[PDB]
Ligand binder design. Structure first.
Ligand SMILES: COc1ccc(/C=C/C(=O)N[C@H](C(=O)N[C@@H](CC(C)C)C(=O)N[C@H](C=O)C[C@@H]2CCCNC2=O)C(C)C)cc1
Ligand SMILES: COc1ccc(/C=C/C(=O)N[C@H](C(=O)N[C@@H](CC(C)C)C(=O)N[C@H](C=O)C[C@@H]2CCCNC2=O)C(C)C)cc1
Lengths: 303, 303
């Protein structure tokens, strides 16, 4: 019993992290086979950051301009290319710690673990969600760029995020590992702001199911609702609409607890309209939306 | 910027986890050098759990009665001994992945990371505190025993917790790696309950400092307080007393923000007496007490 914000074990990703230095900018790289992937603004100075000309900056760089260290072992770069917002540094040694891996572009509302790194060395691991406005609420300082987000599917690490920038909201934006940004953002210091965020409704419902599984059931009421009636209330409280696909995804949790999805939706409607009146659910005074249904199943069933 | 409940990277501990099976009970073991450490109730059946005679159960076990697997590699046990509540299984191979390590007994109010495992394989990692009543609020299912808690100090893993039991509160109890329980608990199915928990005051104050560092400052008021006046209010709200040692530990955060500790204490006193009136601090509607001052410094300074 018990329910915690739980990250994937990070050892497979830890063996992939290296330090990339170009001139005076230093950030992290991801060393897979004989390629190092890292954010392309590693080739920038700060005068190259309000309107950087990346292609111009790159043509003036030769292979030796990139200092890549893995521990106290320097790796020699023997090739470089730019793909979208990411640099690919070909190195003369293949990483012996390379795990089985995939590059994935995740959808809004999905969660992943972040291994935060500085100078190529791990700092900590935590769990994030891709917000509906294509930001993430992370924890990143200067020098954390090149940190990656991932999921572990049995043996395979599915890399889905590489860190690039902070919006002055304290929220964070980045790319998939092909260098395509999540959301409308660009890798320049200009006036970009994220759209308004919304609450991930299917995730809140998964979390209420985790609550019931853990014995915190006070919020269950005697009522039911229709999907359309529920969505009309949710919308007023800035919740995303719940689709029938979402209902289907909650099937396993519904069957484990014997609570129909539309019955749990009636309980959530009452929580939205009435508040919690001082009470907590799973130790939280707010409704939580960064646990997917698969997250809940995995935690409440032992991987 | 940003602040998240962050766990230590778990790769060093992952290479140490194995599966220990004795008869029909299976749990996790910690393989360090040529010794496997695991909870001694691995030798129990359930009829041996209301009043187990561990020494009696153990004398009837021979080395071959312990099946230890590390991946799809079986390790041969060549010796066994019981130390307090933990079994030590001598094995004929030293773990090549053994990191530099220490066995530590932590104090109430300190935090650590838990690598939750089942059948010797990692499930997830999360951050816990040793509560003042010597429990932890974890996430453990059947088969998670032998999971360990740890801190990473630069290169050294300081193992401080091994998981043994769940109290029907949904809270968890265990031993240090010498097999001595934290708190008054014993490894039997009887009627044990933990003492009343209290809020870890120095940790709440560290978290308010993290809030200020991150730009969430609405709760700062114009006042100061004495240490004695503060402790009189805190006590009524089931907060532990703040000592001068605690004040000293907050020195670095106080100097970074320019807020005296006693000034931050006046702000916390007002939060305790008045509530938050709907507002959140760092996204929480409750005051958080599972970040130590070192936690906050480490996260807000990049390891
Ligand atoms: C007026 O409304 C505004 C709206 C948006 C912005 C800035 C977006 C921006 O420029 N973010 C910068 C950034 O992330 N730059 C990237 C690099 C550029 C080329 C995209 C970066 O520094 N990346 C860091 C290097 O690793 C990590 C950052 C910085 C440290 C703070 N936290 C982090 O994640 C911040 C430093 C302000 C400013 C004003
Ligand atoms: C009337 O007030 C009460 C007060 C306390 C208790 C029980 C304490 C207990 O017996 N806990 C058991 C336990 O943790 N047993 C240990 C082993 C014994 C020998 C100490 C165990 O099973 N350990 C599990 C094996 O790995 C992990 C447990 C179990 C699964 C649930 N979550 C967990 O962490 C629970 C299964 C109820 C009961 C009633």
């Amino acid at each position: 019993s018990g329910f915690r914000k739980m990250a994937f074990p990070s050892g497979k990703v830890e063996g992939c992290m290296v330090q990339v230095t170009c001139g005076t900018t230093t950030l992290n790289g991801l060393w897979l086979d004989d390629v190092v992937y890292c954010p392309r603004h590693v080739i920038c100075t700060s005068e190259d950051m309000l309107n950087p000309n990346y292609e111009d900056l790159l043509i003036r760089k030769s292979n030796h301009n990139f200092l890549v260290q893995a521990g106290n072992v320097q790796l020699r770069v023997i090739g470089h290319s730019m793909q979208n917002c990411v640099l690919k540094l070909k190195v003369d040694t293949a990483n012996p710690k390379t795990p089985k891996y995939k590059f994935v572009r995740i959808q809004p509302g999905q969660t992943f673990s972040v291994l935060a790194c500085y100078n190529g060395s791990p700092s900590g691991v935590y769990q994030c969600a891709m917000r509906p406005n294509f930001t993430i609420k992370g924890s990143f300082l200067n020098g954390s760029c090149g940190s990656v987000g991932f999921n572990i599917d049995y043996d395979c690490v599915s890399f889905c995020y590489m860190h690039h920038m902070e919006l002055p909201t304290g929220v964070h934006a980045g790319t998939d590992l092909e260098g395509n940004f999540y959301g409308p953002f660009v890798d320049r210091q200009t006036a970009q702001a994220a759209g308004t965020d919304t609450t991930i409704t299917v995730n809140v419902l998964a979390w209420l199911y985790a609550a019931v599984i853990n014995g915190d059931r006070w919020f269950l009421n005697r009522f039911t609702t229709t999907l359309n009636d529920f969505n009309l209330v949710a919308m007023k409280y800035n919740y995303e609409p719940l689709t029938q696909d979402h209902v289907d995804i909650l099937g396993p949790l519904s069957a484990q607890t014997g609570i129909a999805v539309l019955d749990m939706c009636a309980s959530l409607k009452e929580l939205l309209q009435n508040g919690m009146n001082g009470r907590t659910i799973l130790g939280s005074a707010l409704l939580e939306d960064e646990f997917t249904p698969f997250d809940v199943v995995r935690q409440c069933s032992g991987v």
